[PDB]
């Protein structure tokens, strides 16, 4: 009955659950707002999907994120991955596939790591 | 896992490739195609020691040179090269 989408985000050892529901427009990380949770210089890494997609896409959703593990940098990268993948999955399920494809195209044109986490394996020059 | 590879030999003739082609009213090749004799000149004739003359030798170049006209220095060098191949084997 309720519109709800749960999306994970991943870095070295920092993981993020983001549940996106129908709402008024808030984004909370660990119960505190997104403008509070980061080091003061990496909030520009957090605001990257919102500024790519515009605020009109985030006008309708409410995203709640939990993070665990990692350091400050790994947790910030996990939060921005959870934000971007979360709004793309909500627009996949509950509005049109053309809007899903437009959001995916804008995010992939900026940075692919907002959608697909690339782990660093060990394969040096063999 | 397919099978161990066991040696199989196939006997090709000296006919043209339009004898290996399938049955149809006319060939798919042009007029230039259809004279290719399905075995290379190396299989029509290759000069080697088993098909040389009695007095002559054949070199690595495929050229008949006779032991009588060959000098002493070239005889020594050919003996050294054959002995080098024998030492390599």
């Amino acid at each position: 009955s309720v519109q709800a989408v749960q999306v994970f985000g991943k870095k070295k050892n920092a993981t993020a659950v983001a549940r996106c529901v129908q709402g008024k427009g808030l984004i909370k990380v660990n119960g505190k707002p997104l403008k509070l949770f980061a080091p003061e210089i990496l909030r520009a890494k957090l605001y990257e999907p919102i500024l790519i997609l515009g605020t009109d896409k985030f006008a309708d959703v409410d995203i709640r994120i939990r993070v665990a593990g990692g350091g400050h940098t790994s947790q910030v990268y996990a939060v921005r991955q959870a934000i971007a993948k979360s709004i793309v999955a909500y627009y996949a399920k509950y509005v049109d596939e053309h809007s899903k494809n437009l959001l995916k195209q804008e995010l992939i044109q900026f940075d692919r790591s907002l959608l697909v986490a690339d782990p660093r394996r060990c394969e040096p020059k063999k | 896992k397919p099978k161990p590879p066991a040696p199989t030999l196939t006997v090709v003739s000296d006919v043209a490739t339009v004898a290996m082609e399938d049955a149809q009213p006319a060939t798919a090749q042009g007029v230039a195609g259809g004279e290719t004799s399905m075995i290379a000149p190396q299989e029509v004739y290759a000069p080697s020691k088993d098909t040389a003359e009695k007095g002559e030798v054949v070199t690595k170049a495929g050229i008949p040179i006779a032991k009588q006209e060959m000098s002493r220095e070239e005889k020594l060098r050919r003996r050294r090269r054959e002995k080098e191949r024998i030492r390599k084997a």
Binding site: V5, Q6, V7, F8, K85, V88, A89, A92, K93, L115 | -
Partner: protein, 58 residues
């Protein structure tokens, strides 16, 4: 159980390798027992991920 397995591969949740398998008599050899798994958009796969609490909706 084998009864539930025949029901699931008649409903078509199981692929072997890259191709979905609808025949419940497909003889799985010893090196394709490493490649039998669920299909792409499987509700059974969503059930397993929802149990393990890793339900990624992307």
């Amino acid at each position: 159980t084998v009864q539930a397995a025949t029901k699931l591969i008649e409903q078509g949740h199981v692929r072997v390798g890259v191709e979905e398998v609808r025949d419940p008599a497909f003889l799985v050899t010893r090196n394709m027992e490493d490649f039998v798994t669920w299909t792409v958009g499987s509700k059974i796969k969503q059930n397993i991920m929802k149990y393990r609490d890793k339900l990624d909706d992307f």
